[PDB]
């Protein structure tokens, strides 16, 4: 069972390395309601096939660099540019809450 997930591509900015945003629900061990939570994976795009806003299955793989342990599996979906501009706005938001 070599673990595999799904996500969106939120980053172009590395050679052969994309960043994938992967969410999951799971119910709250105490207050008991589902919580939606998420994590970012740097993944291996050898030939720079995947572009941004794509939805991709992602896989457990022998190590590539510090930070890079998963290689792109397939292309599930093309251009969900909404999740993208979403995460991107969260990030723009960090810019408040400051000094």
């Amino acid at each position: 069972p070599k673990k595999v997930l799904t996500g969106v591509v939120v980053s172009d900015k590395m050679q052969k390395t994309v960043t994938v945003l992967v969410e999951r629900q799971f119910p709250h061990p105490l207050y008991g309601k589902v919580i939606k939570r998420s994590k970012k994976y740097l993944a291996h795009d050898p030939e720079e096939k995947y572009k941004l806003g794509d939805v991709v299955e992602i896989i457990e793989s022998r190590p590539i660099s510090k930070r890079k342990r998963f290689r792109v599996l397939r292309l599930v979906e093309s251009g969900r540019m909404d999740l993208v501009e979403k995460y991107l706005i969260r990030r723009q938001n960090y810019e408040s809450l400051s000094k």
Partner: protein, 138 residues
């Protein structure tokens, strides 16, 4: 909007019955219809109806009470002594077969929504499924 359809159903019933009404319109749903089918066959409502009010679909819910009390306060004994929602929009509750409660010493019921469809605790239990726990009735 209406944030829980269902709750509001149960409530309509509740304030309805408390004020001793012979029956009540509630706004119509295939699901809310299941639930009253269960609620009915199981003894608590006189039964219900599929109505149309002002060109819109409603279910009339006819309403049952026990006989006339003596002494002061002749208001008759409620049948639907209590009805309450369990799963709630944004806080959900799903139960194993081993986790399905049982109610007021068996004198009441639970309503579960399963992939066998909507059924009572007893029904689920003999069916052997779990599900979202809709409501406590007794």
């Amino acid at each position: 909007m209406l944030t829980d359809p269902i709750a509001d159903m149960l409530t309509r019933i509740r304030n309805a019955t408390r004020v001793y009404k012979e029956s009540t319109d509630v706004p119509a749903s295939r699901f809310k219809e299941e639930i009253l089918r269960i609620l009915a066959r199981e003894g608590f409502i006189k039964g219900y109806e599929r109505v149309d009010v002002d060109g819109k679909p409603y279910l009339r819910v006819y309403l049952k009470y026990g006989p006339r009390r003596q002494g002061p306060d002749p208001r008759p004994e409620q049948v639907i002594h209590h009805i309450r929602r369990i799963s709630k929009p944004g806080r959900r509750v799903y139960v194993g077969v081993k986790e399905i409660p049982r109610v007021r010493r068996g004198l009441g019921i639970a309503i579960l929504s399963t992939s066998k469809g909507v059924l009572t605790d007893r029904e689920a239990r003999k069916l052997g499924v779990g599900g979202e726990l809709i409501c406590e009735v007794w």
